[PDB]
Amino acid sequence: PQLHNGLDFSAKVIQGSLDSLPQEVRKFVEGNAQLCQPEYIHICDGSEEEYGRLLAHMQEEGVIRKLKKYDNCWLALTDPRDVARIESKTVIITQEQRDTVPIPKSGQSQLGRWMSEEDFEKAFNARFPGCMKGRTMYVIPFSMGPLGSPLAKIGIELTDSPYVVASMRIMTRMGTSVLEALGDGEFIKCLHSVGCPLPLKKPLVNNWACNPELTLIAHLPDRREIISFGSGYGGNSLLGKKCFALRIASRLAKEEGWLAEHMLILGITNPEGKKKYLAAAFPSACGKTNLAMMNPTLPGWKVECVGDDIAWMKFDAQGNLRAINPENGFFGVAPGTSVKTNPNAIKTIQKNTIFTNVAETSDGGVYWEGIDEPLAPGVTITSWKNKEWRPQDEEPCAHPNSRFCTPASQCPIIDPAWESPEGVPIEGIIFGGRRPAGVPLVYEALSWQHGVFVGAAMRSEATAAAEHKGKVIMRDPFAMRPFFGYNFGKYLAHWLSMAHRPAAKLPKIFHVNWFRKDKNGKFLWPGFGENSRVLEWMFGRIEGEDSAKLTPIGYVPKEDALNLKGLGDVNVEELFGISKEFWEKEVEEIDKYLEDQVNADLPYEIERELRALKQRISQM
Template sequence: MTINDIKHPKVKAWVEEVAKMCQPDDVYVCDGSQTEYDRLMKKMVDSGLGIPLKKRPNSVLFRSQPSDVARVENRTYIASKTKEAAGPTNNWIDPAELKKTMTGLYAGCMKGRTMYVIPFSMGPVGSDIAKIGIELTDSEYVVCNMDIMTRVGTKVLDVLGTNGEYVPCLHSVGKPLAKGESDNGQWPCADIDNKYISHFPEERTIWSYGSGYGGNALLGKKCFALRIASVIAKEEGWLAEHMLILKLTSPEGKVKYVTGAFPSACGKTNLAMLIPTIPGWKVETVGDDIAWMKFGKDGRLYAINPEAGFFGVAPGTNEQSNKSAMDSIRKDTIFTNCALTEDGDIWWEQIGYDAPGPLVDWKGNKWVQDKANKAQEPAAHPNARFTAIAKNCPAIAKEWDDPAGVPIDAILFGGRRPSTIPLVHQATSWNHGVFLGSIVGSEITAAALDLKAGTIRRDPFAMLPFCGYNMGEYFQHWINVGKKSTEDKLPKIFFVNWFRKTPEGKFAWPGYGDNSRVLAWIFDRCEGKDNAVKTQIGWMPKADALNLTGLDVSAEIMKDLLSVDVEGWKKEIADVRANHYPKFGDKLPKELMAEMEGLESRLNA
């Protein structure tokens, strides 16, 4: 398709304006077809950028530059009109100043390349909860990944019509080519000082320059679906959250839908694709990363997964931790920065088996596993990724693509906490739940150089890197959302912690599939079952309320997992009061201070 196929005058004018600034050799409007995907993938393979995998049909491996391997938080900006609007947790730059800098970088940046126009829908096309974006990019890698991660193509332009709303997303790898020059099979990107991932919340616009990787370049993902969407959600009265969505079915065939927010490395994807260890229970996946929730006419919150694929971290994914993910990536998958085996397959650390002979590592060098050498560099980058089609997941719920969304019964929060936080407790009210979400965090280990070991790195609602405006106002927005319905219709809120440790330093709870035992208790709570006791910190399971049949955990450890650590919680409140809440100044909702003071008085009673 060409620019003339765009019927929306504003979109057409914007595309023409960007083409004039960036000076690509060609402009191509994507139709989202399989033929188009195959042609662009072949172009990358033929150029030496992509390596087809003999062992996995229709799957290709890419290697990025070592400087372009992850989201770059310190190059990610919220350029709101005022610094206060961005808040204390975001990088702020004056929007006029940032646009001047980036316009200079964009001038001529697509020379020697094609500019692709990607019309995409976040959420099922035409859904009342979905939103439309247009990404302009000079990267075929981005087009193919966006094809998997979003709904791309002509049908999106049809819904957009001549005057529909959309979010403009401009991206360039920042590496123009001289006449006759090529990338020579090398991943194109700019140096680190010229990387910018910029958001203009008032304009609902995203500009990205210099990176070809992940959330820096697939602008539908964190940039749109969280940072810009969180701003839109605040204005329109809904929630755009960094949450999984799962469907939980009881042995009796009853269904509950659960969302969950966890900081990175806390098992979000694993929980979304969990295989229960207790008979008769079933977990199916609606989404593994992002949830958009809007109120239905019945006063309940309905959620969609705005994405159409999984952009998962590969290392640590294996048959035990996440069998459904392993099944999802057997075909039709883009792998990035994984190791390559001699017989044309991928490999990464903790895949569940030793390296099958010599490998080519993510940097393109020969790599032979040496288990005796603890200092050996990994064969796959720790942030190596797979981009997989959601419908290829055997655990995908039939409702995952429902334009109406699914009604949410429970919201989970959690982080990596070796002590203090019990296995599970339930908030006594919506505002108490918002308080729990606001203090989410993970304990720092000795491996982190920037913070003292044993301190808590707070990541409220697991949204710290993704909230597009002042986080104090974000807390207030959650409280305001609670006022739009009644407690009986709002989801119940729970705090879980799979990561408690014994005095010997071992994980006290087995996790993985056994987390279904906690989900079953949460299910019963949503059914109104009297299986909980009220404590200072909220509702907790009664003795024998959890199904522990066949579980190898001692009664002593279970008692510890399900008890209130009064002294630990007093320290928790002291830390929140001294180090966390003051950041938000007068933007901190008074309701949260009231919840904290109420908890404090109950602990001191």
């Protein structure tokens, strides 16, 4: 069927067979092979041997180091220019801008970044032609969600990064079995390049191929494509995670009647064995992973982890909100993780785990700020910047957004239904972020509509998960500001529409604040395992216990309803204080934000809830 060789890159296939692929997967591979011009094509099978060999190969080349203190753990140090997400270089392409983001009155949108089809094609042509010269194109078949779940979705990621291949094996279900399950079905098309064709034009910093100048993370939902160039950092290069499972999936979810959210999923069991599942949306680096696998301090209580980051949720024909974790692993913030703060994480990351931008001890272990493990005298530390480090120095040993990438199956409290194809029934949804002032430890929304407004109103101190520096309290509706796949106003309408659904059992909505501080900047709440005390209250409220007092912002715990045994030094009045002054200002600021950023796309119900909150506050 050809006058010469065709577009047949069969000669360059070094694992698997293009003939073995489904026809559409083959076209995707060969088309991009012709564009990117890789030397070889490696069709990933996801096997232990493939993984081990690829890791040793990376080890040979000085791309990673083996951590000799642990069972099969590895360390990658990056170019300091490629350390986190970059929201300003993250774009969604649609025919109309307004389908992607509301048109902001003030001229600049805080809700996503749109690029025209025409501008994107120019950006694409300035980057990808020949970009994989001298490198292997890896073909990664992956499933988001358990294989054969009705809620699961398959993708194919093309990459020239062995680091991406290894990390995808942990964070997704990856390999031959995914291709077999896929058959001739549709798949999300994911294209990635580090953007450093050989021979190299500039020298690599720290053996980490990247192209910060041309870095662009693009989403084309109408073509079912994700196209990411120039960054190896996980959020930008593990295309199943933020790019697919939040951005693409949120819009699909809108179209099909389900939800794709930046939420942990956990099971909480009381001392008498009664169990419920909760979902929680906190902004990046605001405590989801610590909550999802919390070691509860309250005797008798148990927490089990379903997922720590992304939730796909859909009301079943019985009206239960069913959640699955679409990921296969945890891509968790390293700094702060200790036996004290997160004992279950520490046990998970003992083996089969890839660390990125943490420090290395002289005995082949890992180190970071807040690890809370003294080292023997004589043990020295290499920083994430590959230099000798002392606790003297005014510079952290690990990068603030350094990460572990670890299999979810190893979590000692992984929930028994964490791969159930039907999902787990959600009875409560928790919103929250970092608020140093004004917002009490916990409150409960008055209705679904108020609950959606509470999600929409979320604000949170900036973190190191993206490019944002300092401690400015930013707006982060639903913890989804960096991740909306479409118009935020339409997303709110979609959320509100859940109330009108066949027999839907709407979860109770809560808002929490672990991060309230006193005059001296000291946390008023110790948090971590002590947050079990907040979860107890939520549990009883879902059961219908009369443990709530009505305030202007919603229901708070009655006096003595929170179990504070073992925490008698906690200042309850300060922690739970609601100031008319603060809240007048808060509502005014929410008003102006929504009017500016959402305007004509703002649902009536949300504006109504705003008007109601304002009125309730005026009566204080």
